[PDB]
Amino acid sequence: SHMEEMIRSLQQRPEPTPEEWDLIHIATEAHRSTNAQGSHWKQRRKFLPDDIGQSPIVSMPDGDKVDLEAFSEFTKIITPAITRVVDFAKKLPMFSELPCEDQIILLKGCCMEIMSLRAAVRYDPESDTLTLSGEMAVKREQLKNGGLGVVSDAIFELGKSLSAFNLDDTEVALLQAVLLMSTDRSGLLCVDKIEKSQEAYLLAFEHYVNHRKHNIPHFWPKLLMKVTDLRMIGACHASRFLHMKVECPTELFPPLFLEVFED
Ligand SMILES: N[C@@H](Cc1cc(I)c(Oc2cc(I)c(O)c(I)c2)c(I)c1)C(=O)O
Numbered sequence: 479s480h481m482e483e484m485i486r487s488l489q490q491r492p493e494p495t496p497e498e499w500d501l502i503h504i505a506t507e508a509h510r511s512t513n514a515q516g517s518h519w520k521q522r523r524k525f526l527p528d529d530i531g532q533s534p535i536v537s538m539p540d541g542d543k544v545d546l547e548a549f550s551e552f553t554k555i556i557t558p559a560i561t562r563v564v565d566f567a568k569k570l571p572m573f574s575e576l577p578c579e580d581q582i583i584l585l586k587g588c589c590m591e592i593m594s595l596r597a598a599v600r601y602d603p604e605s606d607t608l609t610l611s612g613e614m615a616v617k618r619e620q621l622k623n624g625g626l627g628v629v630s631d632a633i634f635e636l637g638k639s640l641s642a643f644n645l646d647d648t649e650v651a652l653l654q655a656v657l658l659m660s661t662d663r664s665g666l667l668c669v670d671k672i673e674k675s676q677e678a679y680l681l682a683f684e685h686y687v688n689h690r691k692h693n694i695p696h697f698w699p700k701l702l703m704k705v706t707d708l709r710m711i712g713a714c715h716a717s718r719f720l721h722m723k724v725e726c727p728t729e730l731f732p733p734l735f736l737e738v739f740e741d
């Protein structure tokens with residue numbers, strides 16, 4: 479119609495359908511309601527003390543040693559952070575309608591990917607820190623030494639790079655949904671359903687990106703490349719975590735931390 483043509487005049491690229499907009503809205507709100515500190519994170523965060531995370535003392539196979547005190551500080555707050563990812567997932571209809579066993583598998587498969595993304599979008603250029611759970615600002619060396627090793631470098635590099643993308647809450651939520659609904663995991667029942675859900679999120683996401691009209695060229699494939707980086711972060715973390723478990727006693731690991739990663 480004439481009105482449609484008028485408001486779509488400066489559009490070319492496909493916009494979200496009314497169905498995709500519903501999908502987009504639910505995911506955005508699921509993220510906002512489970513994202514710690516919302517928009518008050520820069521005012522509310524406190525820095526991890528500088529005398530913490532300077533003393534790596536416990537050996538690891540790759541030679542990046544672990545600072546036990548720093549490791550303790552990070553794990554003290556990891557349980558509520560993991561809980562929030564589960565809270566997010568539970569709010570997506572396509573996730574909550576899966577068999578319980580599939581839900582657990584998907585959560586374990588994407589948990590580090592999502593937490594790292596949530597840290598990375600709160601990279602702060604002026605202090606050169608990430609913010610963990612919207613409350614702990616950490617430096618590169620601290621997060622490296624407290625257990626993550628080279629995984630810390632990778633997350634900081636992602637966070638630095640994401641600054642120019644100016645992602646909004648919707649874009650973050652949709653990245654999360656895409657990470658969540660992956661079938662690259664063993665033991666899933668509803669493979670086809672999970673893939674169709676990921677495809678629906680991906681297409682809504684591509685269309686939302688069109689709607690946003692970012693200033694950066696080639697935005698969509700650039701963001702897809704970031705998904706691959708998050709995947710590699712997740713994989714490096716899974717490997718390092720196995721090593722952590724070999725080196726350190728169970729008592730240093732919160733129960734939920736072990737459960738999500740012990741796979
Ligand atoms: N179900 C899939 C969906 C998915 C497919 C592709 I195709 C893709 O894009 C790339 C780009 C490069 I470069 C790669 O090396 C790889 I591997 C994937 C991405 I991002 C995600 C999944 O959950 O991953």
Ligand SMILES: N[C@@H](Cc1cc(I)c(Oc2ccc(O)c(I)c2)c(I)c1)C(=O)O
Nearest residue numbers: 552556559593594596597610611612625
């Ligand atoms: N910032 C996120 C939550 C978040 C919390 C923590 I503690 C993080 O550090 C980790 C993660 C895995 C580890 O094995 C170790 I040792 C440290 C990261 I990276 C992210 C949010 O806002 O939800």
